[PDB]
């Protein structure tokens, strides 16, 4: 099996309370699909879409991840930033 690509498309910026639009536009999987992503925001929170809207209470760099796991059950993690200002 070959492991997905997750796409996570960081750098994120955004202001506190704003809704921060996530993509995983671009992860795929060579030998079969995708399945499930999982979002980590770095603030506590998570998310099973596939485009999360998520906002931040509070100015911050978070780091976020984000789990894609493929039609075998294997996964791969990649990781950004969201820079949430004032
Ligand atoms: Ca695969």
């Not at 997905?4 to 704003?18: D, H, S």
């Not at 995983?24 to 499930?36: A, M, T, Y």
């Not at 509070?58 to 996964?75: F, R």
């Amino acid at each position: 099996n070959s492991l997905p690509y997750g796409k996570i498309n960081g750098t994120y910026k955004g202001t506190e309370k704003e809704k921060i639009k996530f993509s995983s536009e671009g992860s795929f999987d060579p030998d079969g699909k995708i399945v499930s992503y999982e979002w980590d925001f770095g603030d506590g929170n998570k998310s099973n879409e596939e485009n999360p809207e998520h906002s931040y209470d509070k100015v911050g760099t978070y780091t976020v991840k984000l789990k894609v796991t493929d039609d075998k059950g294997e996964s791969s993690v990649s990781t950004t930033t969201a820079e949430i200002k004032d």
